[PDB]
């Protein structure tokens, strides 16, 4: 009964094994196994006596790594039944009951062997094993063959989100429950999101150039295939092509067209000349990554991006998490950038501040002053070093004019702005108490930005992101049903809890129309609004946008904040990921904009 | 449902609390407690929705120190119900689920407090508590009040033997089982044994003199009361009296009559002059041990012995452990010397070798030579440096004549002797293949010596020591029943013990030992016994029996050093054995050995 994770479309996507116990009949236990236990300790004062008491404990003894009982240990440590264990393996397991962490073969393999050999030595002296059995068993290595009990190979970020969140809030006992967790994840949108982030990061990566083979003269067996990339060993380099040994044992040829993109990376702002021969790109013994075409008739040279990215999409009416991608590929690490990647939003924050100016009486047409400004010793500059003077509020937001944002912040007040930022979903302790917050200096998570932008899509309400629709026990009993706060209750029929209003309907609508004007004054849709975002030195590229049914936030940046490049300002890398996702996710859906009539 | 330990009369003596879970109804949970869990993390994406999912885990979350669920944590850390906890205590508990060892307030108090205060800060930010409630809560110390969940205050060595052995062979799940272990321990005999060992070690200790205070300038709270001794801190020393602070905060006075015995210890053989003033005995800030009167009116200065001892008593017909004492007191030393105290038996081993000489056809009256002897490069000497010449085998055994023992080993053979020693538990790797085994050089446990002497008491059979009669589940269903090997089945299907010694040899040795105890050492004529001593009097042993009970006593220092020049011949171990046997056998009929 593992914890099971399902999408909102009834697909089982993940299974998480917790505490395991597989009871066996005492007489089904190999005699050498019982003897390994009988030899595990120097004395017994309970032979026949210890054998009989062992029957009461054999199926429950804690043996480390979630194994309770001998059969669970045989399964967990070696992927074996009790009858398949060798004498060396039976002695290893018998050595664990006393201290399943001090004698554990995973955390302390050196200490584990010492305990095993001592029991093996005692089996020999008690005549349980022969000298030949002893010599074979003592020379035997740990031979661990641990099966994966965390099955998550369909939509890994969605599976891991459930396991990680349950363990963070409720500890490891959360996995032992055997519950069925029915998520809000839309499998079609999740698949679109995974592809859109992979494609988007590769598009950024390729224009920034070839960074060389990931390894040279290393065994091909030490590498893994992921993200539709296959490790290969270069065996021959010709003038316009190269041959490489693949993990399937075959030798493939990469033609010129498959590698000619490989201009060399110099820095984020510079690439070398287009390569003129295959020897400039690869060397014999290099470990490279190849990708086949549709039918495997041609192979091309690819590169795993160094840059990272994420995508989070929520329903703005109730906060349901529809799709989530935490990085280029789950194989890289379990880190989920949508939920844990704290970054500065930069200009992506501006709609939140400008909404407060709208609340305070201003209109999208109100004239605002883009002029030099000094506060104490601080002189904020516009990214372009120019000043536009009196301009409409909507133009100031479209152009992300820093001096306007600071004046608006001076007008509305720092504390009122911080409070509204918290109402949008930003974290109190991550919001500085100074004027730089108008420039997007708070640290935020992409999921908080998506919560904030949902406010514009839903008419001025605070929704809360959620990923559980229901929980059932292992027997089909529904034991939890989501009761989210809804922005618009009648909109469900197309319930009980009404979301709190955080902006006047008129302010939310004015901002949604500004953001639609922004997107339309740069998909074949007319119901989308969105804002690009950038941070100083182009360390982040963001895009936050929506229609009435879906809010998506995309981000691109290096994990160790570093420039994306001078031509990468203005959220350039993040926008195509959002466009691809939104276009495909919304395909076949009617126009859904702001609700002016339906309550 | 804790693991329970019972004596043979079915009286409860110990309880060991394992994994604890006390389920509560969700409506009975104080709102501030739910709010502490809601404030435990910066972000929740399942705090409205967390409130409902929490009901699914609130009684199950692992909270460290064997606590599963909030009510178990309230009990384990604070000895409270959930509604008695303060806001600070609720926040402490709510910080545990994520990493119960990393945030454990016992193991990591600074980190646990940092975690607690961060949660209190979030409860304030979230509006779950007021600024007043917050300031009160953050200023609150950890204030742990942890109840002891291991109850073992009646017959401690007996309770601990069950817990220690089960955990050693089967791990912590042994305690969580909730099994009721019905032991072979005879309650009355266990009580007699505890007192006999305590008194015997004190009699040795007193003869050897006052060794000064237990500690000097140390915190009184670090000491424990045990064996009717109470730690106290000297606060004032007068000419012939002293005042001392007790752990309850009271101050008592010890008059001259309660300390005049304090002759200082010089070495194992020498005691200094008798003191004339209190300043020669104690100093202010000394941590001393005091003992009260039969009701409480006067206090005397006592000493916890440095010397150690043990007692093991078994039924020779089946190996049932009737009484076990592992040291002076469990609360002084948890180590059980009966089961783990490897020592040399010295002359205590001699009856085994001499019984093998009887098996070969010699008799108690066979003339044997106590004379100088050399075997290669080895020249074994008699401990007293004297040689008796031609003497009866029984007299050589009584007088523990080393040269006779060596001659008998030459006759019997090393391998036959080793086989008998292994036949009663003696560890093979612990028995040399040389002539020193005639002198009692194998390393042995007292329990193995008891198994050995049972061979004489039972007619020549191998019994196995055992302490479990039966095990019942938490509901009372018998899940295990001892099926021991019996020397004499009609004396109780039943398993028959293997014969390891000729019947006539076991019987004749039993009578030699009866002759030794009656004529060379209780109003009984059904007792046999042998004193035991090692080189330089590093051990004092007494092994003896009647037909129904075998008892082995031992006295010695854990770090082997001489007991003293006047401490040869098992002198310190004999009264412990006499006191125990006299009291344990009281009101039982004569029970001796049978020739078959």
Automatic annotation (TrEMBL), chain A:
The shown residues of the full protein are 52 to 762 of 851
So what does this thing catalyse?
A: [GlcNAc-(1->4)-Mur2Ac(oyl-L-Ala-gamma-D-Glu-L-Lys-D-Ala-D-Ala)](n)-di-trans,octa-cis-undecaprenyl diphosphate + beta-D-GlcNAc-(1->4)-Mur2Ac(oyl-L-Ala-gamma-D-Glu-L-Lys-D-Ala-D-Ala)-di-trans,octa-cis-undecaprenyl diphosphate = [GlcNAc-(1->4)-Mur2Ac(oyl-L-Ala-gamma-D-Glu-L-Lys-D-Ala-D-Ala)](n+1)-di-trans,octa-cis-undecaprenyl diphosphate + di-trans,octa-cis-undecaprenyl diphosphate + H(+); Preferential cleavage: (Ac)2-L-Lys-D-Ala-|-D-Ala. Also transpeptidation of peptidyl-alanyl moieties that are N-acyl substituents of D-alanine
Molecular function terms from GO: penicillin binding; peptidoglycan glycosyltransferase activity; serine-type D-Ala-D-Ala carboxypeptidase activity
Please indicate if the UniProt record lists Transcription regulation as a keyword: no
Tell me the route in metabolism or biology where this protein functions: Glycan biosynthesis; Cell wall biogenesis; peptidoglycan biosynthesis
What gene is behind this protein?
ponA
Function of this protein? Cell wall formation. Synthesis of cross-linked peptidoglycan from the lipid intermediates. The enzyme has a penicillin-insensitive transglycosylase N-terminal domain (formation of linear glycan strands) and a penicillin-sensitive transpeptidase C-terminal domain (cross-linking of the peptide subunits).
Q: List the disulfide bonds.
A: 488-491
Q: Member of which family?
A: In the N-terminal section; belongs to the glycosyltransferase 51 family. In the C-terminal section; belongs to the transpeptidase family.
Annotated protein name in UniProt: Penicillin-binding protein 1A
Instruction: State the EC number(s).
Output: 2.4.99.28, 3.4.16.4
**Penicillin-binding protein OB-like domain location, by residue?**
209-307
């Amino acid at each position: 009964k593992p914890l099971q994770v399902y999408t909102a479309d009834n697909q089982l996507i993940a299974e998480y094994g917790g505490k395991l116990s597989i009871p066996v009949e005492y007489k089904q236990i190999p005699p050498n196994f019982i003897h390994a236990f009988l030899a595990a300790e120097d004395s017994s004062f309970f032979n026949l006596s210890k054998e009989d008491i062992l029957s009461l404990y054999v199926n429950k003894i804690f043996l480390g790594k979630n194994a309770y009982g001998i059969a669970a240990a045989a399964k967990i440590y070696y992927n074996k039944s009790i009858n398949e264990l060798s004498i060396a393996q039976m002695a290893m397991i018998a050595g664990l009951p006393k201290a399943p962490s001090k004698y554990n073969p995973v955390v302390n393999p050196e200490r584990a062997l010492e305990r095993r050999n001592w029991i093996l030595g005692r089996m020999l002296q008690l005549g349980y094993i022969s000298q030949a059995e002893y010599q074979k068993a003592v020379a035997e290595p740990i031979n661990l063959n641990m099966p994966n009990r965390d099955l998550n190979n369909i939509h890994p970020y969605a599976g891991e989100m459930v396991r990680s969140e349950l363990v963070k809030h409720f500890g490891e006992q959360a996995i032992d429950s055997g519950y069925k967790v029915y998520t809000t994840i839309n499998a079609k949108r999740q698949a679109i999101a995974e592809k859109a982030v992979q494609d988007g990061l590769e598009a950024y990566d390729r224009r920034h150039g070839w960074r060389g083979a990931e390894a040279h003269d290393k065994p091909l067996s030490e590498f893994r295939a992921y993200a539709n990339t296959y490790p290969a060993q270069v065996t021959k380099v010709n003038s316009s092509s190269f041959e490489a040994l693949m993990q399937d044992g075959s030798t493939v040829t990469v033609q010129w067209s498959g590698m000619s993109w490989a201009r060399p990376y110099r820095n984020a702002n510079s690439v070398g000349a287009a390569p003129s021969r295959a020897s400039q790109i690869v060397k014999v013994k290099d470990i490279v990554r190849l990708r086949p075409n549709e039918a495997k008739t041609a192979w091309s040279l690819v590169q795993v991006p160094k840059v990272q990215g994420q995508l989070i999409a929520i329903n703005p009416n109730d906060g349901s998490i529809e799709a989530i991608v935490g990085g280029y590929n789950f194989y890289q690490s379990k880190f989920n950038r949508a939920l844990q990647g704290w970054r500065q939003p930069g200009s992506t924050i501006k709609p939140f501040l400008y909404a407060l100016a709208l609340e305070r009486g201003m209109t999208p047409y109100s004239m605002v002053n883009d002029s030099p400004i000094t506060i104490g010793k601080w002189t904020p500059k516009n990214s372009d070093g120019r000043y536009l003077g009196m301009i409409p509020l909507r133009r100031a937001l479209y152009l992300s004019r820093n001096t306007v944002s600071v004046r608006l912040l001076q007008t509305v007040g720092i504390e009122r702005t911080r409070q509204l930022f918290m109402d949008f979903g930003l974290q109190e302790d991550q919001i500085p108490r100074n004027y730089t917050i108008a420039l997007g200096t708070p640290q935020v998570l992409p999921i908080q930005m998506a919560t904030g932008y949902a406010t514009f899509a839903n008419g001025g309400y605070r929704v809360q992101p959620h990923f559980i629709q229901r929980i059932e026990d292992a027997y089909g009993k529904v034991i939890y049903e989501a009761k989210p706060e809804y922005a618009c209750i009648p909109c469900i029929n197309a319930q009980y809890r009404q979301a709190q209003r955080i902006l006047k309907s008129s302010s939310a609508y004015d901002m949604a129309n500004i953001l639609r004007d922004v997107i339309e004054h740069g998909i074949g849709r007319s119901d989308l609004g969105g804002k690009t975002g950038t941070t100083n030195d182009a360390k982040d590229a963001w895009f936050a946008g929506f229609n009435g049914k879906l809010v998506t936030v995309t981000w691109v940046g290096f994990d160790q904040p570093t420039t994306l490049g001078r031509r990468e300002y203005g959220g350039i890398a993040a926008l195509p990921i959002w466009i691809n996702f939104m276009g495909q996710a919304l395909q076949g859906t009617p126009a859904a904009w702001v609700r002016l009539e339906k309550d």
